[PDB]
Symmetry: C3
Subunit: 437 residues, 3 copies
């Protein structure tokens, strides 16, 4: 869509809007299964027995791995979830008596089946590999007369089990993202199609398979009665196509000559924001979200739920309805923030700060303060010894002029070195130390 | 074992106990080796020469990689170690004159051998792959008459070297966890059995191979005199089966109507705790520890060693023997902490906070404040737009009633925005600003 | 070279010097290409058709993956770049009309070619795999008469495409480090040789291929007109062979008997420092830099550019030219920092702190305070329940005696719990609270 951006000279911040949400709100747990086989020398046979040893070792390795129950600025404000708690709950259910054999018979004549579990969970079940049938029908007649083509074919069919076992071996039975060995592209797509979700969610997931993989978990579960089972925990996107915007912030300092006499302020509420259920889902670690064109994929486990009035901080940081969060300091170091459609430059001290085009070099020299340049005609920005490439996605930027709010503060009573602060908190500290003077 | 949990309404925190320790306290270094070979066209031979090129390229790649010496709330309180310093020391010893050939002759007639190094280190040595013998006896007669079965067999035997070389290529010669290509499951188990440790440590490591892999390092060391050698650094668990407990904390705020008039406090001493040598090993980043049933695997490199009196903060946060660490703020945002056996809910402002069961939906609505619900009969908790699944492991929870200690503070003199603080420090700041008023 | 180290008893810090810089300052973007093929049963043929299905699935998988534009103490002071912004810009250029076919014809008769793009970018282009030619000439005659040797050969040639597709599938089309499947060791070396850089940079990159891989990105770009193209973003080292030094800091506390009466101070400016263009590039997260012998590889994106006067803080922390950054607290916990050539020990309270040799055990017991021991004759240091191995690289340490500056502060007016502070800031807070007393 149309991505747009606004820079607020008054608060050294920029908002990128036009994005659409895809928030993981829940989990769908499926049970993926591989059916196992209970079981002089020719050259072609010696390799078959070598591959068969790799197969038993993989089985006993996975059995040995399952002796234990499976487990695994404003970010510090986040709660603490247990991401695979739902999959582990389902996996705990697979250990009950004859619960495994319910699945075994469900998939006797199909590869995809839905099974109600004894506690009422309605899971999709998938037999992705019948090694039982291959080994019993093609390999067992030889062991109880070899060609080279079955050796090739066995290695191919056994390779998937060996790779699944490798992933679980270096990841303590819990992997993310979910590899194509756990679930092939076609398997996952068909799993998505049979999922109980909207046509909207099916289209979204099918068109973003790579993101679904990254937000999914594979939990090695049980080996019992010739059945290898691991739970695949898939994301549920209960919030879709709501407006999202990214808030970029950078430090705003006074620019006095006498070094150390300068005071700084930085909006700490940077990150992603998406409208969600009458509130705003705020993701302080914008690293958690994944952007595909204009679609933002986030996990609500790494969000706060804030009043929508938090959006007022962008137009009016002194608004009376929400207490905008800032941090203060006297550390006027130079840096840049690359935004969606431009660049914020916090230039202080003796630092060289410029913006350049690929064919003509420097086109703007910044002066001390916080400033901004859009990515039209600009390819790179330099702050000191650091070169930043700007994003070259298209979209209009708007420079909103306004006086830097740091000018409104008397440095002699300014409370520096406050991190978890806000506009009101800084006011009340000022008007206390003012009371003594 | 029996995991139990206690929630302290007074301080918005919960302790999970019943766990048993397995703390990595040291390192065991082994030297793993692969013996190398110094060395019209038929179809079967062209593939043999293609595989042989892959083998030389892997050798020269590993030689090119070794031109350099190998290298690689309260977390900020931690020291700073050098994790592979012991392996690198051993690897430095392998570069001495004829030191490589000591190993070469030790493993002439065995694959597992113990070798005393020239500085006195007593290392286990392992020849996991004799490519020398394979190439010289099966491949060299052909090059200096091809069947397809050796082409298959050569690719299999060479694959391990190619995979080891890949891992070292994308990891600058130092890998963790240690893959099954570095050390197969059977190789590691037998390596563990020949280790100089207790039957307790051998059983523990053999039953938790996947955890040993994650706490181990593979350090590519030397290629010299037809010997490829890399050091595998294995964990030593010098602390085993001592009591451990997990401390979960969440913010505790007043719940006044007038927004911004509320003060908050959070216990910052959350993480894992294990009794250890008359003190308490405290792991502030509980992400560092790995839980297998009731066994907690931690690394003492990411611990502080604290007086055992730190445990008093759970029963009496005002105790006179240890100065319990808290942080203060006015940031009353809502969130939840999922514990071992329940959930802490810090619910403030206008946030919807509930606890639900899978079959009947909402069963508890939280009111403003810090509260808790056990995982019996509860499957999920919701705070705002965030759904948390609770862990469904069994164990008894105890709700310990008590007045939230935040009520004991006058907001007008409460020192907010203190992170590295404590009960005594907040008292002494209060009684200073009180002195002026 | 000669690594040396100095410990400053007065400020509980140590500097390691003698290192040489290799700073990534820029990016070189190359376009790697793979030429694709538009396309009863014998046993040997059934496997060929199985491998051919793996090939189509890989193609449609990569097409499905590209529906979206590709994307991906003092660290908080850093700016925020967009690391693959330059590669994505080039990739955006490959989507223009007939721009793909410019590359297609450039590499018609060569595998390495330089192509000027329509916006003026001069990129190197590389055809690493002609699957088009293999499938059309060897496989198509069979499908439109099988031996086992082509089945083997096809699987080998198709394996690279399958592995590239796997990496892009679990990494949303953007990978780092760049694997040997993206770019083999010989391909990368030859790519480096044809790069437009100095003989100095070519030697440096060729001798540190593993570091180049870790600082590189592979960006899946386009599949169009039988051409698979992904951009490889290689580092440009515009700063080479300038002096670097590592600053290690640890907490400095008073050591009074009465617990809680102690005040602490820690230099927060720890990390790597390299001379760069008349300033100093400061890398606060020393984890970002990679050390190969005496060569330090860093990324200027994770640096601040500071006045070179920052170096004065090591000899004179009260110097009048630069305001040295410290943090304050009353949290006198014990810990150690392992340096390049020794160990800093911050020992407080009741903690056992010692230094040991492998053959003789304890050789030094530290007393309360901040102290240091060089790695000559010392193999391990113990602080509480934590054993640290010291680095055993050779080089001389110098112990610079001086009174711990924490003694210069009256605890009754000492401002504790200041994180983003400095020497001057602590002075001005003291002389304010002093004014009231
Ligand atoms: O380390 C922390 N501190 C010390 C501190 N105090 C500061 N003061 C100023 Cl002016 C500027 C930065 C400051 N920091 C560091 C910034 C932290 C971050 F990197 F996550 F952003 C915290 C202060 N309050 C709340 C949470 C805090 N955490 C986080 C959880 C460990
Ligand atoms: C609370 O304080 C506010 C601070 O604004 C200005 O900034 C500080 C750093 C000093 O310059 C201070 O003297 C200035 O006034 C005031 O604007 C505000 O009016 C005060 N509110 C009340 C109710 O007194
Ligand atoms: C030190 O201060 C303590 C603070 O307790 C209470 O909380 C603060 C926020 C205010 O309400 C304060 O007025 C209250 O007293 C005291 O409880 C304690 O007794 C004081 N100690 C001494 C020795 O004065
Ligand atoms: C500013 O304050 C400095 C502080 O030095 C000492 O440390 C503190 C904790 C107290 O002990 C204080 O009384 C001490 O003086 C002074 O050294 C410095 O001279 C002061 N500067 C001015 C201009 O007053
Ligand atoms: Cl960049
Ligand atoms: Cl969850
Ligand atoms: Cl160590």
């Amino acid at each position: 869509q149309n991505i747009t951006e606004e820079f607020y000279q008054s608060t050294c911040s920029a908002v990128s809007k036009g994005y659409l949400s895809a928030l993981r709100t829940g989990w769908y747990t499926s049970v993926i299964t591989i059916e196992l086989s209970n079981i002089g020398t020719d050259a072609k046979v010696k390799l078959i027995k070598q591959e068969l040893d790799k197969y038993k070792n993989a089985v006993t390795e996975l059995q040995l791995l399952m002796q234990s129950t499976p487990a695994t600025f404003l970010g510090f404000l986040l709660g603490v979830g247990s991401a695979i708690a739902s999959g582990v709950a389902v996996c705990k259910v697979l250990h009950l008596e004859g619960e495994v054999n319910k699945i075994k018979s469900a998939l006797l004549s199909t590869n995809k089946a839905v099974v109600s579990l004894s506690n009422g969970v309605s899971v999709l079940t998938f037999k992705v590999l019948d090694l039982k049938n291959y080994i019993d029908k093609q390999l067992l007649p030889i062991l109880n007369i070899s060609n080279i083509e079955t050796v090739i074919e066995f290695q191919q069919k056994n390779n998937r089990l060996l790779e699944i076992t490798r992933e679980f071996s270096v990841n303590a039975g819990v992997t993310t993202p979910v590899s194509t060995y756990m679930l092939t592209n076609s398997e996952l797509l068909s799993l998505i199609n049979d999922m109980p979700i909207t046509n909207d969610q099916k289209k979204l997931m099918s068109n973003n398979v790579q993101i679904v993989r990254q937000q999914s978990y594979s939990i090695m579960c049980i080996i019992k009665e010739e059945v290898l089972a691991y739970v695949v925990q898939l994301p549920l996107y209960g919030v879709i196509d709501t407006p999202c915007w990214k808030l970029h912030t950078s430090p705003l300092c006074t620019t006095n000559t006498k070094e150390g006499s300068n005071i700084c302020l930085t909006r700490t509420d940077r990150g992603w924001y998406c409208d969600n259920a009458g509130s705003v889902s705020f993701f302080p670690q914008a690293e958690t979200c994944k952007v595909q064109s204009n679609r933002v994929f986030c996990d609500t486990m790494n969000s706060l739920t804030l009043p929508s009035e938090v959006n007022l901080c962008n137009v009016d940081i002194f608004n009376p309805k929400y207490d905008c969060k800032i941090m203060t300091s006297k550390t006027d170091v130079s840096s840049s923030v690359i935004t969606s459609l431009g660049a914020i430059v916090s230039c202080y001290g003796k630092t060289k700060c410029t913006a350049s085009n690929k064919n003509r070099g420097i086109i703007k020299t910044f002066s001390n303060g916080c400033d901004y340049v859009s990515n039209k005609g600009v390819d790179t920005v330099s702050v000191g010894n650091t070169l930043y490439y700007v994003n070259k996605q298209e979209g209009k930027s708007l420079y909103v002029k306004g006086e830097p709010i740091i000018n409104f503060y008397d440095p002699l009573v300014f409370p520096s070195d406050e991190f978890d602060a806000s506009i009101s908190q800084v006011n009340e500290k000022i008007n206390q130390s003012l009371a003594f003077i």
